Amino acid sequence: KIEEGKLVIWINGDKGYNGLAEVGKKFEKDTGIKVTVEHPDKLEEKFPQVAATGDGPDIIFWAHDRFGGYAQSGLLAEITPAAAFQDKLYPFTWDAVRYNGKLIAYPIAVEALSLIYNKDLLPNPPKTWEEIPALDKELKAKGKSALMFNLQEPYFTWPLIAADGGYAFKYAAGKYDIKDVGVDNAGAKAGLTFLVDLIKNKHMNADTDYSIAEAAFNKGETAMTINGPWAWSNIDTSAVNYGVTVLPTFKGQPSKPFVGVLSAGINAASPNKELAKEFLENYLLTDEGLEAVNKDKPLGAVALKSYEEELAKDPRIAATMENAQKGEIMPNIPQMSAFWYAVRTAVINAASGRQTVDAALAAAQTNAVDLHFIDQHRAALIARVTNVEWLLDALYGKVLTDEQYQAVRAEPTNPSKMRKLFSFTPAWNWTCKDLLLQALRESQSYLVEDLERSAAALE
Ligand SMILES: OC[C@H]1O[C@H](O[C@H]2[C@H](O)[C@@H](O)[C@@H](O[C@H]3[C@H](O)[C@@H](O)[C@@H](O)O[C@@H]3CO)O[C@@H]2CO)[C@H](O)[C@@H](O)[C@@H]1O
């Protein structure tokens, strides 16, 4: 369904998709080829479902951590840049898009979280995490708060979890050891325990998400946030005089954010592989194309040597790279998505007091290499489950409360009912998710078996 002779691109909604569209309207202005830029919700979860059916985009943009799983699933075309083009990008970015010795995507830009602070509220940002509670007590007297950031995505809390010793998968003897997971060790527990103590002492709210924290910082209600380069654009538009600096230390050790390399992969099922090769090598990864995107939403430290040189003088980019050097490059192994789902649940349940830090991380450690059926097939289940009330009755009193049950029933359509149902699942642990799978098996076995079958077809 990917029609030949055009280019469809998926990029995340927080990136500069209008800047990328400008690169595509010039590509169309030169070669006659139309390119459409799209930013669907959960594109990175849907791509494995739509690529295998000959749909989805020609080019998918995401951070490199998802790409090893796509490559293992046969969903990405091997990219064959010349040795002369490879020299235009830094070698460590090519390493991030290398899976089994082969290049599976084009590196675009290096991303790391930084501490972003309001210089009018906070001329001297805290050097340590341990200072933040006293800061917040001082700024609550003025009607403000110290810090707000997204607690719903584990990416934003990971720098604190890794500071004192948490890690994802240990790199040993040239490869990531998936039997050596570090999310429930003492250092991980110490970091998450500090986060929980911030919530307990009313220095943070467990409900804070991306838009709440962005709105709070950009309206001058909070003195700091934690975010990446893509967010700077909306702060420039605000009236906030902001700085970008090193993340606070924790127990005297740097916060260790996971470093992402924004990357562009080519659908293995695309009949436009060489039109995507030419758009990526000759129109995006130029100084002109990267500036069209970076001027929409900043990219961070771009992988193209010639343009990075120009932008490296930005103190915001210098701070991004200081944080990046204290952190670690994300693995790209297929187990990363299961790892992220496991840590999302642990962080959300610890923050809300539904689990202790110890229990939440112990559960995450056990599940870090196994991707659950309903997480893998969320979008297809929303679209294709037909008897929602039967699932609701099977979950009532085990996994669904009456307040949750009523919220789902109040939704008008089956996809919107399932959407609402799935909005509760980040807090469910493995056995709760198993209950939904067993209910689906009893009422719609053909659907489960269909999804299982197509997943195995990728191996
Ligand atoms: O929490 C569930 C979530 O886990 C996985 O998402 C992770 C991304 O794979 C990972 O790249 C990182 O995402 C951040 C991007 O790197 C960055 O460009 C920017 O957009 O912020 C993103 C975080 O919001 O971290 C997330 C985990 O937080 C998995 O791929 C998702 O499908 C899954 O929903």
Author numbering: 1 to 459
The publication says:
NLRP1 is also an adapter protein, which along with ASC bind to themselves or each other by homotypic interactions among the death domain (DD) contained within them (e.g., PYD, CARD). We found that the CARD of NLRP1 (NLRP1CARD) and the CARD of ASC (ASCCARD) interact with each other in solution and cells.
An investigation of different linkers between MBP and ASCCARD found a linker that allows the crystallization of MBP-ASCCARD. The structure was refined to 2.0 Å resolution and exhibits excellent agreement with the cryo-EM structure of ASCCARD in filaments with an root mean squared deviation (RMSD) of 0.502 Å31. The crystal structure confirmed that the structure of ASCCARD is not affected by the MBP fusion tag. We generated a high-resolution crystal structure of human ASCCARD and discovered that CARD structures are highly conserved with a six-helical bundle with a Greek key topology. We found that the Type I interaction mediated by the residues from helices 1 and 4 (Type Ia) of ASCCARD and residues from helix 2 and 3 (Type Ib) of a second ASCCARD is highly conserved. The Type II interaction formed by the residues in the loop between helix 4 and helix 5 (Type IIa) of ASCCARD and residues at the helix 5–helix 6 corner (Type IIb) of a second ASCCARD is less conserved. The Type III interaction formed by residues at helix 3 (Type IIIa) of one ASCCARD and residues at helix 3–helix 4 corner (Type IIIb) of a second ASCCARD is also less conserved. Structure-directed mutagenesis on ASCCARD demonstrated that the three interaction types of the DD superfamily play critical roles in ASCCARD oligomerization. Site-directed mutagenesis on the Y2H construct of ASCCARD showed that only the double mutants of D143A/E144A and N128A/E130R grew on SD/-Trp/-Leu/ plates instead of SD/-Trp/-Leu/-His plates, demonstrating the roles of D143, E144, N128, and E130 in the interaction between NLRP1CARD and ASCCARD.
